[PDB]
Design a binder for this molecule. Structure first.
Ligand SMILES: O=P(O)(O)O[C@H]1[C@H](OP(=O)(O)O)[C@H](OP(=O)(O)O)[C@H](OP(=O)(O)O)[C@@H](OP(=O)(O)O)[C@H]1OP(=O)(O)O
Ligand SMILES: Nc1ncnc2c1ncn2[C@@H]1O[C@H](COP(=O)(O)OP(=O)(O)NP(=O)(O)O)[C@@H](O)[C@H]1O
Length: 1285
């Protein structure tokens, strides 16, 4: 319909071009006016004949908005155009829409204000958000506050506090301190938002309107225009209603009435049916008489004592009204059933009522599919589930498990992105059944456990968002206004309830009381029957809380330590917990280990022994032991004295004792030192002391091995860290603690080692004997049941005998299960290596022509001819006279003629038959690290394409069993060994975002491809599909502009830049012959400014908008793009990625994510070039506009801060991996690697640019953004970078 309207020059059956606009404008204005006053009763939009017409009204309202959205897109494409998103319309249409652009834009900006209200009414925040952003962008020259209000409300409905915060900062640069409060409410903090709203209202009116609430001192620690006043007043009521605080609602109503009567506002009025609120309060309080009496005033069919027309007339198409109607119907059914209990008397009519209610409640879920939303409504889903549960209990009389709401504790780890309202609705309908159980004499289903589970989960979610009052009420209900009250009232779900109470006490501010309660609870849990997950959780929580207050708790730990070798409540409790009866001695930790630090180790050991099935207990103990072991070993670089004195039957004894442990080939050095100092039983004491010093490493190794064995449950990020630590300790110290490493490696599984395989292969040249054997055995074992990860590396390596015997053994071991596969793999590798002739001859001739102006040339030519002796036959039959020509020219135009002929014949498409072809192959694809069900190669592409201007790349495709094509890129003489390390690093970084990705719609991810080297110079790189280069959009825009200007090729970036820098330099005195270094800064800034003003800054934004189908999809794609850009910007700045031109940045229109390809200018290599680069990442005009109206002030900055926080927390693993990359014999860095590692470490530690000052995450993000967005740095950049676009 939209296409027909645009293609007809707006001349539809509705009338002329103006009649259509007038009709749409009138309908939109009427609907918008009805939003302000819900009593307008718009004809054909608020009335229906039955319950089915009402759903149709909402459907029609959504369709109208979709039609307008498509019409605008088509008009824009008609007068401006796109780049592959939409097809160019005919010339006649383009000519008409180009001369009428002003009228079309004026009409749109004229109705944009009403469209936002209509979108807000229809429950489609995406429409109003997009329209608001478009309206704000045009406002570059009191309608500004209304737009901000609608935009903030829409963003609040979408649960996007980051965008709200960005908008607050953006608006602060134009009396808008109330936006932050809405941001707080968008995160689920209803208790704090109401207080902030009251504080703002008391200042915008001058009259105090506060109400009684929880202690404001601890509330903050746990987490003038009439329109603004009314908006804030209504939001406060909404916040109070969300947590179901009826008393607070009544108090707020009284306060609002008093404030209105004390200021004669005449415009401030709460828009909320209080009769419905009173009915809800009465129903929840158990007073069914008052509830049924109050329900008679609400609209709709009378309470049960036709079925199709249950909803009343004049109903607004607002989903909020539908939710209220459904709630009223549910309450009526519940009251009717309760009165009927005290089976077809009053059970026959209620079933039909509930069935109709359920049929109506599925409307919103159905509408959620018409628009690609990727998610279902939350309140609407629970309404339908509650109706189903009520229907089941009315017919089964609470006798089947289907009568309960399917809300369990499992939602704790899968629904962290939702507020507490769903739990409130579930609890409201569950308590009714619990109370109803008292009127059923027959057997029923146990609801007490379900109620306890729901209450505990609701309390946990309430505490996680600062709602102390709600959490207190829920905990009290489960247990059947000041912190002191909570302390005096709280100090299969027993242990969970106790731990939750302790956590709430800690959140309220009483850390000492919470610690004491946890200690008392742990002492009892350690003497329980099961206590599996209860002891570990309590001990780990107590240990974590102790580290927080390390300054105020260090004194107590010392006292408890001294008390053990011979006290407050917490100290005595800790003493009793560690002194419990069933491996760490004080002698091995009395050298450089702090006294309070030993208590933590004992606590970790106790947690690990009381719960051997918990992986967390082992990981914590292993980490603590490893850190202290490294510290004691670094710092160290009675029985012993008695043994030495007895075995040596005054200064000599002291010297010998000092030399025995001075700095412990070691045996020879010790013997020489002893002989030179004293002048053989010293070997026993020396061995005993060296073994005692390495006790921490042994304990850490045992704990790490146990943790890895328990993961054959825990995040892979921790697994990679443990494996890296074990490998590093085994490489560094191998002979001192070999007894543990040997057995552990011989018994450890092979699943947690699939992430450090390259490091294992790299450490195969260790200067030891059993170390190499152990690594080889581990790799051989990994090959079994998983040969797709050892096949290519072993085959390439086998194609210093230490680095050869291991590879041969691995290949032999892997060939014992499929010799045919190994042979085919070797044949394929050989064919690929030989498919890298004409190219060699051309290169040799070109090099000789330049190196000529003797015997070296003759020798090189002879070697090349000897090396060259389907495709080779043709080359030989066509140029076999080369040898004769070279021999005749030895005693020289033949070489020049051959080179010229080759160059002329060079100026792509090849065939596989002439350059063999297998089928039904069972070889793994080149790179299947993450593939549970590996796909084998099925065929090979019959054609090969050669990429021009980029050396000699070959695009080869591979067929799979899944009938899908997998493109690849073959490179010759590139040495892609370093790229593989970068790709592995990217995967390790992505590994740290697994936890945060479970409760965030826009996932934190860094797109990357696979790199498979095929030797020392060649390699196979994966091809990225679905992502287009950013330069394409600029090129298409240039072509469109040229075509438009032709009526009434395109220049290259260098040609366009010089054409402007020439006259500018000539107008000041200098000339083009002057060196680029000696160029005025003002001239460069002026040319950059002139170039930016000529290019449109919304190319990418418009392309992304035109690619999406619905507003919801547009919002999802925009958020995905912002988060991906932030993640890649921080990753690139941390590693030091450079050369970020338009051809190296790709964009996936399907999802909105970005992906980089070239990585040869990493590790700050772009800073030292002919034209140095001073920007950390690309933040040009087009990149910033695609982020929205606020730019880098909202989601981008916050996402960047989050990414930096995660990296700073997990920098240990990144540095460990980088160290391994540095010490790699297969990586060609050319102490450059040491400098690179130090630079990365400094950036990760926050000490990027500072002598001794350590910056913060926010400061670092701000500094990087400022350095990447300033015009002074973008002007003095290479012209090929295209800083103006
Ligand atoms: O109360 P719980 O249900 O046990 O929640 C805890 C804990 O919550 P609190 O910090 O509010 O006490 C943390 O939840 P998030 O921070 O991830 O939202 C997190 O612990 P940390 O972040 O402090 O490490 C995680 O525990 P963990 O990360 O160790 O798995 C989690 O669940 P569990 O404690 O049950 O594991
Ligand atoms: N993984 C990839 N996926 C898709 N396209 C790619 C990939 N890698 C490179 N390309 C593109 O395919 C071509 C490969 O040629 P390439 O050799 O990378 O260009 P180049 O000028 O030599 N830059 P460089 O790679 O640093 O030498 C270029 O046009 C790249 O933009």
């Amino acid at each position: 319909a939209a296409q027909f309207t645009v293609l007809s020059k707006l001349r539809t059956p509705l009338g002329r071009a103006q009649d259509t606009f007038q009709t749409i404008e009138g309908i939109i204005r009427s609907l918008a006016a009805h939003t302000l006053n819900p009593d307008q009763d718009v004809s054909q939009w608020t009335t229906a004949d039955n319950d089915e017409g009402h759903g149709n009204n909402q459907l029609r309202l959504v369709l109208l908005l979709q039609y307008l959205e498509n019409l605008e897109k088509l008009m824009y494409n008609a007068y401006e155009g796109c780049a592959n998103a939409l097809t160019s319309p005919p010339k006649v249409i383009r000519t008409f829409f180009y001369t009428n652009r002003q009228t079309c834009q004026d009409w749109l900006t004229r109705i944009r204000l009403s469209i936002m209200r209509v979108g807000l009414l229809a429950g489609q925040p995406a429409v109003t958000v997009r329209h608001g952003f478009d309206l704000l962008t045009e406002m570059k020259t009191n309608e500004l506050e209304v737009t901000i209000m609608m935009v903030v409300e829409a963003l609040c409905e979408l649960h996007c506090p980051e965008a709200i915060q960005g908008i607050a900062v953006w608006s602060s640069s134009i009396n808008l301190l109330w936006i932050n409060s809405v941001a707080q409410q968008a995160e689920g903090r209803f208790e704090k938002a109401s207080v902030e709203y009251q504080e703002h209202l008391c200042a915008m009116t001058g009259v105090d309107c506060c109400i009684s609430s929880f202690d404001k001192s601890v509330l903050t620690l746990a987490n003038s225009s009439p329109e603004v006043i009314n908006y804030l007043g209504n939001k406060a009521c909404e916040c109070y209603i969300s947590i179901a605080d009826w008393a607070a609602v009544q108090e707020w109503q009284n306060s609002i009435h008093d404030l209105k009567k004390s200021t004669s506002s005449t415009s401030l009025n709460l828009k909320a049916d209080f009769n419905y609120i009173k009915s809800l309060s009465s129903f929840e309080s158990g007073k069914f008489v008052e509830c049924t009496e109050q329900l008679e005033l609400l609209p709709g069919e009378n309470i049960n004592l036709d079925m199709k027309k249950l909803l009343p007339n004049m109903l607004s198409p607002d989903p909020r009204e539908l939710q209220k109607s459904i709630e009223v119907q549910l309450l009526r059914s519940s009251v009717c059933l309760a009165t009927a209990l005290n089976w077809q008397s009053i059970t026959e009519n209620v079933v039909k009522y509930l069935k109709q209610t359920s049929r109506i409640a599925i409307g919103p879920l159905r509408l959620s599919t018409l628009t690609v939303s990727q998610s279902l409504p939350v309140l609407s889903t629970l309404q339908l589930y509650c109706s189903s549960a009520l229907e089941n209990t009315v017919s089964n009389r609470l006798s089947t498990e289907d009568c309960l709401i399917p809300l369990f504790s499992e939602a704790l780890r899968s629904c962290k992105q939702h507020d507490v309202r769903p739990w409130m609705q579930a609890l409201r309908y569950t308590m009714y059944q619990n109370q109803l159980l008292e009127k059923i004499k027959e057997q029923t289903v146990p609801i007490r456990s379900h109620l306890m589970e729901l209450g505990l989960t609701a309390a946990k979610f309430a505490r996680k968002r600062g709602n102390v009052s709600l959490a207190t009420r829920l905990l009290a209900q489960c247990s059947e206004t000041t912190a002191q009250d909570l302390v005096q009232h709280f100090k299969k779900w027993g242990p969970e309830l106790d731990i939750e109470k302790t956590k709430l006490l800690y959140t309220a501010g009483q850390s000492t009381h919470a610690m004491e309660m946890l200690s008392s609870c742990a002492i009892s849990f350690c003497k329980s029957v099961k206590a599996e997950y209860a002891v570990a959780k309590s001990i780990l929580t107590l240990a974590k809380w102790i580290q927080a207050e390390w300054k105020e708790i260090s004194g107590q730990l010392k006292q408890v330590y001294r008390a053990q070798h011979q006290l407050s409540t917490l100290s005595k409790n800790i003493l009793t917990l560690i002194e419990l009866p069933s491996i760490e001695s004080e002698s091995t930790v009395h050298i450089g280990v702090g006294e309070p630090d030993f208590i933590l180790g004992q606590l970790y050991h106790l947690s690990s022994v009381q719960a051997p099935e918990v992986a967390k207990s082992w990981a914590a103990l292993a980490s603590w032991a490893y850190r202290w072991g490294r510290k004691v070993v670094d710092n160290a670089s009675x029985x012993x004295x008695x043994x030495x004195x007895x075995x040596x039957x005054x200064x000599x004894x002291x010297x010998x004792x000092x030399x025995x442990x001075x700095x412990x080939x070691x045996x020879x050095x010790x013997x020489x030192x002893x002989x030179x100092x004293x002048x053989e039983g010293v070997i026993k004491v020396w061995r005993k002391v060296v073994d005692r010093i390495f006790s921490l490493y042994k304990l850490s190794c045992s704990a790490y091995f146990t943790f890895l064995k328990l993961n054959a449950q825990s995040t892979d990020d921790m697994i990679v860290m443990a494996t890296l630590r074990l490998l590093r300790l085994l490489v560094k110290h191998a002979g001192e603690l070999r007894q543990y490493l040997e057995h552990g490696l011989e018994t450890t599984p092979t699943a947690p080692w699939r992430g450090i395989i390259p490091q294992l292969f790299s450490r195969l040249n260790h200067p030891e004997v059993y170390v190499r054997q152990s690594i080889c055995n581990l790799l051989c074992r990994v090959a079994q049941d998983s040969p797709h990860l050892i096949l290519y590396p072993a085959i390439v390596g086998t194609i210093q005998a230490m680095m050869q015997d291991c590879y041969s053994k691995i290949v032999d071991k892997l060939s014992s299960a499929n010799p045919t596969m190994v042979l085919q793999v070797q044949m394929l590798v050989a064919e690929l290596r030989r498919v890298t002739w004409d190219e060699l001859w051309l290169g040799v001739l070109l090099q000789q022509h330049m190196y000529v102006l003797x015997x070296x040339x003759x020798x090189x030519x002879x070697x090349x001819x000897x090396x060259x002796x389907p495709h080779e036959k043709w080359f030989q039959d066509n140029y076999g006279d080369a040898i004769e020509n070279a021999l005749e020219k030895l005693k020289x135009x033949x070489x020049x003629x051959x080179x010229x002929x080759x160059x002329x014949x060079x100026x792509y498409i090849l065939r596989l038959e002439e350059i063999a072809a297998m089928t039904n192959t069972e070889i793994a694809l080149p790179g299947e690290v993450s593939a549970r069900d590996t796909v084998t190669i099925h065929s090979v592409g019959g054609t090969i394409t050669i990429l021009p201007t980029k050396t000699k790349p070959k695009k080869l495709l591979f067929l799979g069993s899944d009938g899908k094509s997998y493109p690849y890129l073959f490179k010759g003489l590139e040495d892609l060994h370093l790229d593989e390390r970068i790709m592995q690093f990217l995967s390790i970084v992505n590994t740290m975002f697994a936890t945060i990705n479970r409760q965030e719609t826009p996932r934190f991810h860094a797109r990357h491809y696979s790199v498979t080297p095929l030797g020392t110079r060649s390699g196979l790189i994966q091809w990225v599909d679905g992502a287009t280069p950013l330069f394409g959009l600029y090129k298409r825009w240039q072509q469109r502009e040229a075509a438009l200007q032709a009526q009434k090729i395109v220049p290259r970036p260098s040609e366009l830049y010089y054409s402007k820098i020439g006259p500018a330099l000539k107008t000041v005195g200098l000339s083009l012959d002057v060196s680029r270094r000696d160029w005025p800064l003002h001239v460069m800034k002026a040319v950059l400014e002139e170039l930016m003003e000529a290019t449109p800054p919304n190319l990418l934004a418009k392309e992304l908008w035109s690619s999406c189908t619905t507003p919801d999809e547009w919002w999802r794609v925009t958020q995905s793009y912002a988060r991906s850009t932030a993640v890649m910007s921080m990753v690139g700045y941390i590693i030091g990625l450079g050369d970020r031109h338009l051809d190296n940045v790709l964009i996936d229109m399907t999802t909105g994510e970005v992906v980089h390809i070239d990585y040869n200018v990493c590790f700050e290599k772009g800073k030292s070039l002919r034209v140095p680069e001073k920007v950390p990442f690309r933040m040009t005009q087009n990149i910033e506009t695609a982020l929205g109206v606020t730019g880098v002030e909202g989601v981008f900055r916050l996402s960047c801060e989050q990414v930096l926080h995660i990296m700073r927390r997990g920098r240990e693993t990144l540095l460990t991996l980088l160290e391994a990359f540095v010490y790699d014999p297969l990586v060609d860095w050319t102490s450059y690697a040491v400098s690179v590692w130090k630079r990365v470490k400094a950036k990760l530690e926050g000490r990027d640019v500072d002598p001794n000052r350590r910056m913060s995450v926010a400061e670092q993000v701000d500094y990087v953004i400022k350095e990447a967005t300033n015009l002074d740095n973008l002007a003095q950049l290479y012209e090929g970078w295209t800083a103006w676009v």
